[PDB]
Amino acid sequence: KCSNFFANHWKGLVVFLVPLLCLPVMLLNEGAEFRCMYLLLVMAIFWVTEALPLYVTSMIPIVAFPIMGIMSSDQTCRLYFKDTLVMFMGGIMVALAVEYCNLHKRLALRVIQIVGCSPRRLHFGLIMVTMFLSMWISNAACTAMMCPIIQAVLEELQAQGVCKINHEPNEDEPPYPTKITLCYYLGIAYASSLGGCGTIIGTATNLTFKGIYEARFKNSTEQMDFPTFMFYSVPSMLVYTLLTFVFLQWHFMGLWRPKSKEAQEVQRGREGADVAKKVIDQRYKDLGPMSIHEIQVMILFIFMVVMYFTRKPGIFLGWADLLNSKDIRNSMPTIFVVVMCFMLPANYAFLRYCTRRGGPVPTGPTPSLITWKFIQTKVPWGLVFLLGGGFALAEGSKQSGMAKLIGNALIGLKVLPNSVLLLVVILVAVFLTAFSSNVAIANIIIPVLAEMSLAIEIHPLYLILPAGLACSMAFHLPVSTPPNALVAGYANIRTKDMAIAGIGPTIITIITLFVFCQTWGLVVYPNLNSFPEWAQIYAAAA
Amino acid sequence: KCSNFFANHWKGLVVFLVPLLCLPVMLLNEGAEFRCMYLLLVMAIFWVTEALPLYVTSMIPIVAFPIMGIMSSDQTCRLYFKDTLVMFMGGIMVALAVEYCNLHKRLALRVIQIVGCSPRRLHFGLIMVTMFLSMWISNAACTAMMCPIIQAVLEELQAQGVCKINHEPEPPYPTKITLCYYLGIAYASSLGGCGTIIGTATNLTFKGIYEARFKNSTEQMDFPTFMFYSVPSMLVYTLLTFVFLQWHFMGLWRPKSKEAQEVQRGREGADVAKKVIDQRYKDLGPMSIHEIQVMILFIFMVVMYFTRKPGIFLGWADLLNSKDIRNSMPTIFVVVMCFMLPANYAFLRYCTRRGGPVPTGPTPSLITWKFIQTKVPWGLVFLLGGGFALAEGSKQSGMAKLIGNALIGLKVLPNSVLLLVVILVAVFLTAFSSNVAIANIIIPVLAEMSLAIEIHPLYLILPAGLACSMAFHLPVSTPPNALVAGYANIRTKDMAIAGIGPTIITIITLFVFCQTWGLVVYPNLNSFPEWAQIYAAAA
Numbered sequence A: 001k002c003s004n005f006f007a008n009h010w011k012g013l014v015v016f017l018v019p020l021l022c023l024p025v026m027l028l029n030e031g032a033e034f035r036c037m038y039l040l041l042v043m044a045i046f047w048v049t050e051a052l053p054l055y056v057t058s059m060i061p062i063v064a065f066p067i068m069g070i071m072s073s074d075q076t077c078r079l080y081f082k083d084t085l086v087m088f089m090g091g092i093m094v095a096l097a098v099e100y101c102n103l104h105k106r107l108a109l110r111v112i113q114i115v116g117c118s119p120r121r122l123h124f125g126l127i128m129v130t131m132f133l134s135m136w137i138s139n140a141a142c143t144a145m146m147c148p149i150i151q152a153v154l155e156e157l158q159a160q161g162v163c164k165i166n167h168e169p170n171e172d173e174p175p176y177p178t179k180i181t182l183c184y185y186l187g188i189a190y191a192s193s194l195g196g197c198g199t200i201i202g203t204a205t206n207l208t209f210k211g212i213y214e215a216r217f218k219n220s221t222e223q224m225d226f227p228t229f230m231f232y233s234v235p236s237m238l239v240y241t242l243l244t245f246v247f248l249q250w251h252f253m254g255l256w257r258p259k260s261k262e263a264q265e266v267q268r269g270r271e272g273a274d275v276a277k278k279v280i281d282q283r284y285k286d287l288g289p290m291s292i293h294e295i296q297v298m299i300l301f302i303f304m305v306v307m308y309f310t311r312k313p314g315i316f317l318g319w320a321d322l323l324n325s326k327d328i329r330n331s332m333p334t335i336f337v338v339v340m341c342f343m344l345p346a347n348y349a350f351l352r353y354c355t356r357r358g359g360p361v362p363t364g365p366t367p368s369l370i371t372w373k374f375i376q377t378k379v380p381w382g383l384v385f386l387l388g389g390g391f392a393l394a395e396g397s398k399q400s401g402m403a404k405l406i407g408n409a410l411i412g413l414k415v416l417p418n419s420v421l422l423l424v425v426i427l428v429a430v431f432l433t434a435f436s437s438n439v440a441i442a443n444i445i446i447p448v449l450a451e452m453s454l455a456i457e458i459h460p461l462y463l464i465l466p467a468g469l470a471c472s473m474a475f476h477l478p479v480s481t482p483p484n485a486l487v488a489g490y491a492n493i494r495t496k497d498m499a500i501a502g503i504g505p506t507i508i509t510i511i512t513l514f515v516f517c518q519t520w521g522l523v524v525y526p527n528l529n530s531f532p533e534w535a536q537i538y539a540a541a542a
Numbered sequence B: 001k002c003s004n005f006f007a008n009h010w011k012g013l014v015v016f017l018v019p020l021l022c023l024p025v026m027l028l029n030e031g032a033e034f035r036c037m038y039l040l041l042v043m044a045i046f047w048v049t050e051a052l053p054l055y056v057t058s059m060i061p062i063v064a065f066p067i068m069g070i071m072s073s074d075q076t077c078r079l080y081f082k083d084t085l086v087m088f089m090g091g092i093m094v095a096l097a098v099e100y101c102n103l104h105k106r107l108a109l110r111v112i113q114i115v116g117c118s119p120r121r122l123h124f125g126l127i128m129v130t131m132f133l134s135m136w137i138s139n140a141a142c143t144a145m146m147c148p149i150i151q152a153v154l155e156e157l158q159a160q161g162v163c164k165i166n167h168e169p170e171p172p173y174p175t176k177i178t179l180c181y182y183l184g185i186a187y188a189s190s191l192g193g194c195g196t197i198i199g200t201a202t203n204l205t206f207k208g209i210y211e212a213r214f215k216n217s218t219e220q221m222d223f224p225t226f227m228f229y230s231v232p233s234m235l236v237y238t239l240l241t242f243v244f245l246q247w248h249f250m251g252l253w254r255p256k257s258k259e260a261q262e263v264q265r266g267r268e269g270a271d272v273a274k275k276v277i278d279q280r281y282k283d284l285g286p287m288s289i290h291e292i293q294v295m296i297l298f299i300f301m302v303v304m305y306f307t308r309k310p311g312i313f314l315g316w317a318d319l320l321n322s323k324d325i326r327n328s329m330p331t332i333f334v335v336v337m338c339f340m341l342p343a344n345y346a347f348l349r350y351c352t353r354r355g356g357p358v359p360t361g362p363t364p365s366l367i368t369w370k371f372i373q374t375k376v377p378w379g380l381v382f383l384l385g386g387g388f389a390l391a392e393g394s395k396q397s398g399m400a401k402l403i404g405n406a407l408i409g410l411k412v413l414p415n416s417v418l419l420l421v422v423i424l425v426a427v428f429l430t431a432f433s434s435n436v437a438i439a440n441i442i443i444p445v446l447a448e449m450s451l452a453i454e455i456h457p458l459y460l461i462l463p464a465g466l467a468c469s470m471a472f473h474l475p476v477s478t479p480p481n482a483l484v485a486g487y488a489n490i491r492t493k494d495m496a497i498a499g500i501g502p503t504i505i506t507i508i509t510l511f512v513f514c515q516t517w518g519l520v521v522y523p524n525l526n527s528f529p530e531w532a533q534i535y536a537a538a539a
C-alpha cells in the first residue's frame, strides 16, 4: 500500500468503504428515521466527493426506499418527473429553439455595442440585468434564458483574440473551462439566486414562508404586503449583488493583483477598444435583417414569459383564477410553446403558389422552427434524475419522520441570548439548505421558529424574516439549487471549483443579512425589538 | 402544379386543417365526453398519418387536459414515468452495457460455429441467433448488429467466384440469395421481439394499459407467465418462416428449379471459404473478466425477475412485505453496479504478487455515462407516457362507456369469428403505421367492448396485442424493414410479394395456439369471471 496507490485509486476506496463505516448509524438506533439519515449521509458523501457520476448517484433512492420500507416502489418513481421538472425541461427545450437560429448571436452583438467591449464592464452589466430580470421570474427560467447569450458573448471575445474558453487538451472526459468562463457562468447563476430574494413573487420560498406566517398568526398588526416586503428587502439585495461581483472579479480575474497574469490579459483586451469598435460594428452589419424564423421564435418566447408573469401575481386576478375547474400550473404554456415550434413553418415561400403569379417554388417540404434530432443531441437528459432526486428525498424525509426529528432538534437553542440566537439560526438554515430543497427546509424550520419565539417572548418576525431569506442562499454544490445544476450541465463545471468559489457569497450574505436586519428592519417595522400585545395573547392561549 | 403542391405539402395541410374540421364534435355536444373524444380523434389522426413527430404528438395531453375539465397539471405529469417505464429504460441501459465490450459478437459467432457452415445451415443459424438476441434487445439494434457479418461473407464469396451478390448489368438489383439472407434477418428480428415484455415497446404498452384499466384482475401478466404464454408459438412460427423462405428463393423442395444448382455449387465448394472467413473473423481475443462480469450481472437480473412471486415458494417481495417492490430495484441495482465495479483488478499487484506493470491511472468501469447519454432513445418516455395518459383520461371522463354501448351489436357473432376479425383488423392497421401507435389507439376500445359483451378481456387483448407486432409487407411498416431495404437496395415489390408467407403463418399460428395453449396457461378464458361482472355492473 504505497502512497501512489492512494494517489491513483481513492475513488474506489471511498465507494467501497463509506457504507460500511456509516452502517452503525442504523445499527445502533431502531427507527426508520435513522435509516433515512443513513441513506442521506451516504448520498451526501458521494455528492461532495463525486466518486460516482452525479446522475448515477441520484438513481439510488429508487432502489433504497422500497427495501427499507419507507415508501412503495410505484410511488417513488412517480415522485420523479413531477410538474416542476417538466417545466424545467421545457425551458431547456425553448432555449435550444432560440439557439437553433442565430438570434442569440444577434442579441450578443447588440449588447457588446452598448457596453463598449470591455471584459470587466460586460460582466457587470450581465449580472445586473440577470438580477433585475430574476426579481419577477423563476430563477431556473432566467438561467436557462441567459445561458446561450453568455455562450455567444464568450465566442465573440475569443474571436477577437482576448481569451480562450477551454484549456488545451480518458478521451471521454470533457474539456476543462477557463477562469473567465467559470466567472461568467457562476456569475449568472449566483445573480439569479441573489436577485430572487428581492420580491414576494420572485421565488416559491418567499410565498411558502409568507403563507405559513399568515396562517399561524392572524390578527397580526404587522403585515407582509407587496410594497412592505420589497421596501424591507431591496437594499440588502443590492449590497449582496455588488459585493459578490467584486469578489468574483478578485477570485478569477486578479482585480487587485497587477502582477498576476490574469490582469495583463484584461489590460491587453482593453488596449484594443478603438479598432474593436469598428470590427464589432462591421460584423453586426454582416448579419442580414431579421428573418421571419427569428421573429416567430422571439414572439413565442415573449408570449411564454408574459404567461409566466400574469399567473396569480397577487395584485390582480390573472388567467389562473378564470379557470378554476382544475388546478393549472406553469407546465402548460411551456409545452404549448414547444409544440407550437414544431407546428409552425420556417418559411412562407409556399404561399407563392397561390399568390404573386408564382415564383421560385420550394420543391421540398418546408422545415419547421426546430428538429427533434437537435433536441435529442443537445438536451442533457441526466438532469431528469438529478432534479427528481430532490423531490424524492424530500418526500421520503417527510414520510419517514426525520423532518420532525430535526425540528425537535432545533428546540434546544432557547438558552442562547438573542443576537447569538439569530446568528445561529442563520447558520443552521444555510447548512441545511446546502444539501436539500429550499422549500422543504423552510417547511421544516419555520413553524418551530414561530412556536419558539412565542415561548421565549420575542417578536416572531425578528427570527422569521432572516431565516426565510437565508434558505435561498445556496452556492456550494450542483444539487443545492436548480440554477447550479443547469449551469454545471450546460458548461462542464467540476464540483470542486464551484465549492471553492462559493465561499465568498456565503460570508458576504451572512454578514450583510445580520447587519441590515438588526438595523434597517427596526426602521421598517418600528416595534420589532419590543414584544407586542397580540403576541402576549397567543402566548397565554398556547 | 396543382398535384405537385399537394405532393410536397400534405403534412402541413393535415396539421392545419384537421382540428378545425373536427371541431363540430366538441361544439354541438355538451358533455365532457365529447371534448375527450375530440382530443382522441385528433391524436389518432396525427399518429396514423405521421404528420407530426411521434414524441411531440405524445406531449399534447399535458396541455390539453388541464385546460379542459379532465385532470390537473400535477396528475397528468405523474401519469408519465411509471414503474414499468423505469423498468424498460433500465433494461435498455443494461442492453447497452452488453453491447459495450462486444459480448453479442461472441455469442453470435460461437453459435454460428457450432451449427454447420453450408448455406442452408448458415441461414438457419443466422435466423436462430437473431431471434434469441432480439428477445432482450431492440429490433433495429439487432438488425444493425447482425448485417455486417453476412455482408463480409457475401463479399468473400463473390471475390472467390462461387456466387454473385447482384445481377450482371439506378442501383443494382440484388439476387435471390441476398434477398433471402437480408429479409430473413429482418423478419427474425420482428418475430423474436414478441417473446418477452422487454423485447419490444408494444408489449409494455398493452400490458401497462391492461394493468391500469383492471387493477382488481386476478390474472396477472407478470414477467414469467407472459414468457410461458408467448415462447412456444414464437418458436413454431419462426421455424415455419425459415422453411417458407428456403422454398421461395432457394428451391428447397424443387430438385431442378435452376435455383438448387447454386446451392449445390455452394455445398461442393466455398464451404471452406465461409468456414475460414468466419473462423478468422472470430478473432476478438480470449474471453476477458470485463465480459464475464457483465454476463454474470445480466444472468442475475433475469433470475431476480423469475423469483419475485412464485407459486411454489415465498421468495423476496414477500420477505420484504411492508411495501411493493415490483421488478424495479433489480434493474436499477444492476445499472448502478455497472458503474461501481472496476474492469481490470490489475491494481491488486500493489498489495502482493507484483507480477507485472501496475496501472498509472484510474481504472475504467464497465460503462461510461457518455455512452448512455448518446445511445438511449429518450423520446420513448413521452410516447409511452402519452399512451398511458390518454387511456386514463378516457377512463375518467366517461367516454369509455359511450364507445362500449355503441359496439353492443357485435354480441350476435360467435367468439371464434370475433377473434379472427380482431386479429385481421390489427394486422391491416399495423401494415401502414407504427406498432406502438396502433396499440395505443385500439387496446382501450377492445377493453371497453369486452366489458359490454360477456367476454373475458384477456381473450381479445392478448392476441391483438401480439398481432400489432406482425409487419412484413412494406418499408413503412417497421424500422428493420427500412434498414434492410437501405442496405441491399431492395425494391418494394419483392418485399411485398415475399411477406405473404409470414402473414398467413403468424395468423394461423396465433389463431390455433391461443385457443389451445392459453387455456393451459389461463384456465378461465372461456368463462366470464366475477370481477368482470363487478366492473361491468359498476360501468
Ligand SMILES: CCCCCCCCCCCCCCCCCCCC(=O)O[C@H](COC(=O)CCCCCCCCCCCCCC)COP(=O)(O)OCCN
Pocket (backbone or CB within 6 Å): A008, A009, A010, A011, A012, A013, A015, A016, A019, B339, B340, B341, B342, B347, B361, B362, B363, B364, B365
Ligand atoms: C436485506 C437486504 C440487504 C441488501 C444489501 C445490498 C448491498 C448493496 C450495496 C453494496 C455496496 C458496496 C458495493 C461495493 C462494490 C465493489 C467496489 C469495488 C471498488 C474497487 O475495487 O475500487 C478499487 C480499489 O478497491 C479496493 O481497494 C477495495 C478492496 C477490493 C475490493 C474488491 C471488490 C470486487 C470483488 C468482490 C465483488 C463483490 C463485492 C460485494 C458485492 C479502485 O478502483 P478505481 O477507483 O481505480 O476505479 C473504479 C472504477 N469504477
Ligand SMILES: CCCCCCCCCCCCCCCCCCCC(=O)O[C@H](COC(=O)CCCCCCCCCCCCCC)COP(=O)(O)OCCN
Pocket (backbone or CB within 6 Å): A342, A343, A344, A345, A346, A350, A364, A365, A366, A367, A368, B008, B009, B010, B011, B012, B013, B015, B016, B019
Ligand atoms: C372553444 C373553441 C376551441 C378552439 C380550439 C382550437 C384549436 C386549434 C389548434 C391549432 C390550430 C392552428 C394551428 C396553427 C399552425 C398551422 C401550421 C400550418 C403549416 C403550414 O403552413 O403548412 C403548409 C401549408 O399550409 C397551408 O396550405 C394552409 C395555410 C397556412 C396558413 C399559415 C398561418 C400561420 C398562422 C396561423 C395562426 C393560427 C392561430 C390559431 C387559429 C405546408 O407546410 P409544409 O408541409 O411545407 O411544412 C410542414 C412543417 N411545418
Ligand SMILES: O=S(=O)(O)c1cc(N=C=S)ccc1/C=C/c1ccc(N=C=S)cc1S(=O)(=O)O
Pocket (backbone or CB within 6 Å): A084, A204, A205, A387, A390, A391, A394, A395, A436, A437, A438, A439, A440, A479, A480, A481, A482
Ligand atoms: O419540496 S416539496 O416536494 O415538498 C414541494 C411541494 C409542493 N407542494 C405543492 S403545490 C410544491 C413544491 C415542492 C418543491 C419544490 C422544489 C423542490 C426542489 C427545488 N430544487 C431543487 S433540488 C425547487 C423547487 S421549486 O419548484 O419550488 O423551486
